[PDB]
Amino acid sequence: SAEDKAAVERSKMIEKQLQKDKQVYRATHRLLLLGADNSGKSTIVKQMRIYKTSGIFETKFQVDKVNFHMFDVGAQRDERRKWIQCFNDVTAIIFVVDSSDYNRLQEALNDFKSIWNNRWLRTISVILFLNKQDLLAEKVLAGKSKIEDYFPEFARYTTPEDATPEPGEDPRVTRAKYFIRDEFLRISTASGDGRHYCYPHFTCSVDTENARRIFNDCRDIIQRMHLRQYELL
Amino acid sequence: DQLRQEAEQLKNQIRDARKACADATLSQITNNIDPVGRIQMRTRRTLRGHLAKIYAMHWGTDSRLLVSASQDGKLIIWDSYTTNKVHAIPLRSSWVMTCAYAPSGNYVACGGLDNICSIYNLKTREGNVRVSRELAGHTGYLSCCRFLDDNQIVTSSGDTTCALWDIETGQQTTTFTGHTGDVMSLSLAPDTRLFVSGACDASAKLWDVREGMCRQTFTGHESDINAICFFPNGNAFATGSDDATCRLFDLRADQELMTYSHDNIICGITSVSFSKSGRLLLAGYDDFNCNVWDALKADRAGVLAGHDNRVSCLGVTDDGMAVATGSWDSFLKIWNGSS
Amino acid sequence: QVQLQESGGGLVQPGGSLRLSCAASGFTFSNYKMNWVRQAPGKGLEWVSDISQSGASISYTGSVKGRFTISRDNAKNTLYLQMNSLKPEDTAVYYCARCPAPFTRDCFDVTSTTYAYRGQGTQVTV
Amino acid sequence: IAQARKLVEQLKMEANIDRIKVSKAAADLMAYCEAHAKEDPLLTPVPASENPFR
Amino acid sequence: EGCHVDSRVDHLFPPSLYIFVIGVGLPTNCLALWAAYRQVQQRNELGVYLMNLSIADLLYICTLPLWVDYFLHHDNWIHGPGSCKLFGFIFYTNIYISIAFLCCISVDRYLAVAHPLRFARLRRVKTAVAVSSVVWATELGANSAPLFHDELFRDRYNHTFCFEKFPMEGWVAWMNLYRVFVGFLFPWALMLLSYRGILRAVRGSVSTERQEKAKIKRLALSLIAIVLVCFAPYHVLLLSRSAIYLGRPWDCGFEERVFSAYHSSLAFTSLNCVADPILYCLVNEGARSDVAKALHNLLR
Ligand SMILES: CC(C)CCC[C@@H](C)[C@H]1CC[C@H]2[C@@H]3CC=C4C[C@@H](O)CC[C@]4(C)[C@H]3CC[C@]12C
Ligand SMILES: CC(C)CCC[C@@H](C)[C@H]1CC[C@H]2[C@@H]3CC=C4C[C@@H](O)CC[C@]4(C)[C@H]3CC[C@]12C
Ligand SMILES: CC(=O)OC[C@@H](O)COP(=O)(O)OCC[N+](C)(C)C
Ligand SMILES: CC(=O)OC[C@@H](O)COP(=O)(O)OCC[N+](C)(C)C
Helix, strand or coil: CCHHHHHHHHHHHHHHHHHHHHHHHHCEEEEEEEEECCHHHHHHHHHHHHCCCCCCCEEEEECCCEEEEEEEECCCCCCCCCHHHHCCCCCEEEEEEEEECCCHHHHHHHHHHHHCHHHHHHHCCCEEEEHHHHHHHHHHHHCCHHHHHCHHHHCCCCCCCCCCCCCCCCHHHHHHHHHHHHHHHHHHHCCCCCCCCCEEEEECCCCCCCCHHHHHHHHHHHHHHHHHHCCCC | HHHHHHHHHHHHHHHHHHHHCCCCCCCHHHHCCCCCCCCCEEEEEECCCCCCCCCEEECCCCCEEEEEECCCCEEEECCEEEEEEEEEECCCCCCCCEECCCCCCEEEEEECCEEEEEECCCCCCCCCCCEEEEHHEEECCCEEEEECCCCEEEECCCCEEEEEEEECCCCCEEEEECCCCCEEEEEEECCCCCCEEECCCCCCEECCCCCCCCCEECCCCCCCCCEEEEEECEEEEHHHHCCEEEEEEECCCCCCEEEEECCCCCEEEEEEEEEEEECCCEEEEECCCEEEEECCCEEEEEEEECCCCCCCEECCCCCCCCCCECCCEEEEEEEEECC | CEEEEEEECCCCCCCCCCCCEEEECCCHHHHCCEEEEEECCCCEEEEEEECCCCCCCCCCCCHHHCCEEEEEEEEEEEEEEEEEEEHHHHHHHEEEEEEECCCCCCCCCCCCCCCCCEECCCCCCC | CCHHHHHHHHHHHHHCCCCCCHHHHHHHHHHHHHHCHCCCCCCCCCCCCCCCCC | CCCCCCCCCCCCCHHHHHHHHHHHHHHHHHHHHHHHHHHHHHCCCCHHHHHHHHHHHHHHHHHHHHHHHHHHHEEEECCCHHHHHHHHHHHHHHHHHHHHHHHHHHHHHHHHHHHHHCCCCCCHHHHHHHHHHHHHHHHHCCHHHHHHHHCCCCHHHHHHCCCCCCCHHHHHHHHHHHHHHHHHHHHHHHHHHHHHHHHHHHHHCCCHHHHEEEHHHHHHHHHHHHHHHHHHHHHHHHHHHHHHHHCCCHHHHHHHHHHHHHHHHHHCCCHHHHHHHHHHCCCCCHHHHHHHHHHHHHCC
């Protein structure tokens, strides 16, 4: 019966290690980075690093002594309806979309629709990052391309009073940016009742505040699920 | 465009042959067999310790030790008889989706979103579990893996191809192609000469480990196939799909044999496993419940309904003395009958 | 078994009308959301429109919102796409896609390459 | 367009395969089931005395 | 021999109120206990506190019958000193245990909502178990003054008091003052400070609708205000009696004037045992759903 006691001791040690790995595991937040080739999500990784057929890449960073693990799906086929289910428990989904490419601003919108309507993603708040704002601003100012050609409703759309344009920002670029933001928000609010929320942000690839924005979004998400868990809401 | 017409007409010929190979349905012949009745399974044991959702588990030849993979990065080998944790392996990638137990029990395999199959040795000289090999070459995430022996391993990937690898060389001995979709799950035959696989294309394919060619394809499903399992005799297999329907296919018959579905079931099937005798077909569903049906009469015989989340993996011991079910609640549950 | 065959299309001058049909076999047409997608010469698989199971929900792209219309017939288990006021840039191969799983509002991979549940497609020239 | 040739050849190999009637397969499955039912604890609950998971 | 205290409602109001409290609380305090146990099963820390709270309340209920007798027989204890030192001890002290556990719940909610990412160490089940054990030990110790002193007394008039003597002693006066300042006001201030922080954190949230924020504000303010209503009348009377005694202990007239309001204030404090299972449970959709599921399971 001595071997039984040895097995029990081994199980106790394994349980202690498992508990240490549970403190550690609930001490870090997991994020899913999604985007297309047009989106500069790779540049976002190479800029937030400041803090092979691999298949998936991992980027670990820290903000306010809080550790965040981001996973970028690297080598997978265009089909994604299956492995996406692996991320049904991530803290947030950072979706990077090129706002300066109208031809594929509708494919990105369809991808967002799919993500928002997915059964296994109903409880995950999606962090919307409208990347490459400078390209969109220059494209709009040039006037060579018109958003109305791809989204006719842009002609009827008007800038809401809630907008907070940056100083020196042209009315037209603000109108286009907020039109895209409202286009995404329409799908965001089409489905979902207080379970997952969308956070639109005007961001560029070369920016040092993306990590801070992600940290704030995660703080808000954890706060909301604490409100639900602690019976306050 | 002549090749497309040739394919269409030969497919019509195959369908004509298959219907010519259809005299009576399985219900008609099995209408006179005594029904199983009601199968009331009790939760004999509950295994806890996993930090996140279990995705895969597999029993061993000993029918006592079971390996389970969790997406928190842990591969835990539990002793079912005593509930004690025998091994706990920290994985290099957290998003593990499949694991396997070698028949000899000296090695354990796993894989996931990273296109690598990790093989770890359980009988190291130092007594410390160490990774023995990292098979690489797949262009998609690893979905399923099974051991032919301690040196040969069959795996499936999301690149629509399967692969038979020799562990010692660290090279894929054979590559299997023909699926147009993501390969979900593969099942080895009892004699380990042929294996079946389902690849999200409303079809399943049979493959030879020695010849590396596809023998037969079955296309009775309406959606992606998530799980595949062989009949104990090795002559037939069962496939569950997202269409909330299970289907039984006999290799010689070359067509669907029986369909298990019900109106109230409108959710996909995640796992499927036959019993020792093959009379009872066990399937896990996204509705948080496991259903065991009669393999012959096709009527639902029992339901477990003990998990708070979707059932992700289902397995039956080689001796059929217990059933291990792992769901996304971070808990495996061992069920057994009573008398 | 799962087949989605498209019929119709051809060489039509701009400003005409064209009704393309989608015949479906090997599955229950009434329990699946349907989509119409397009691929222009040298371009990717661009999405065009989508219709739900019951037809109470319908969506299009900006380029065809006020031009194309979609419909379904569960009794005949078919899809219909009527194009009016065609434009020269509408020439493409149009495919008729089924969503992966039944009883879902999520259609994730209906535009992916080598998609299993997509039809061969019909050529439209204008 | 080697894909068409490969598909045609694979389906041609599949077509030239000997097949047996559904009745024979069903009879074989039934015979196997009745020839192994008594050895299945799940189908036939054995007494708790010999059940390891008692 | 004492003050000729007398009341025309002490035999009507306290008994009926205690009977109603027992009847409505015992089922609701068992239901809340089950809900808290369920919460702990899901590894939720809060449930632990919600359990202890309920347990304390239950204990209170279990001692009310005897007191219903004490008041139904015109303030006459008839079962001896030990029965007093046990039942009246619970009845005079576990309300402060309940207040302490409400304060713990408020502090935990503040730590969770206002500081979601910073205090994982404190927000654990076993930490809550240790905190609850410490709370129980400290409350039973800081309230053990009466077990060291006589607590049954017979008057020139008919009543045979238990756990009170209106010609009070110095020790009981100081104990009442400590109860007023340490037992009630300090935990209440901590709770109202935790709920203010919770509301402040909620206001900043962008994923919360204005209706949800209004509901949260209503719930927090109701918690604070109902606790105040339950525990203010009795404690203010205690403070006034202690103040007048400490300077003028010979003023028996104050005591004779307050007797009735004192023992109807003491009865009114009992409403907290009913409020707690209704405000920390049965008002949240999840807790109510668990309650209904348990009721259906035990009914079938
Ligand atoms: C000898 C008898 C009368 C002592 C009664 C003490 C009772 C009233 C109190 C004091 C401390 C309390 C325990 C403290 C903390 C916990 C959390 C968990 O572990 C379950 C209940 C449990 C264990 C409490 C149960 C009730 C308890 C034991
Ligand atoms: C014997 C019982 C009935 C006495 C308890 C009465 C309770 C229910 C009363 C007393 C004070 C009242 C609160 C007073 C002020 C507010 C702020 C308001 O924006 C929401 C309602 C709310 C929160 C009231 C709710 C009901 C309340 C808590
Ligand atoms: C939620 C958490 O993290 O735990 C904090 C909690 O322990 C505080 O409890 P206290 O306010 O100190 O109770 C003291 C009462 N007194 C003095 C005996 C009357
Ligand atoms: C028991 C202990 O040591 O912890 C005490 C802690 O809970 C007190 O801090 P709070 O009052 O909760 O926060 C401040 C509230 N606000 C924001 C000013 C309204």
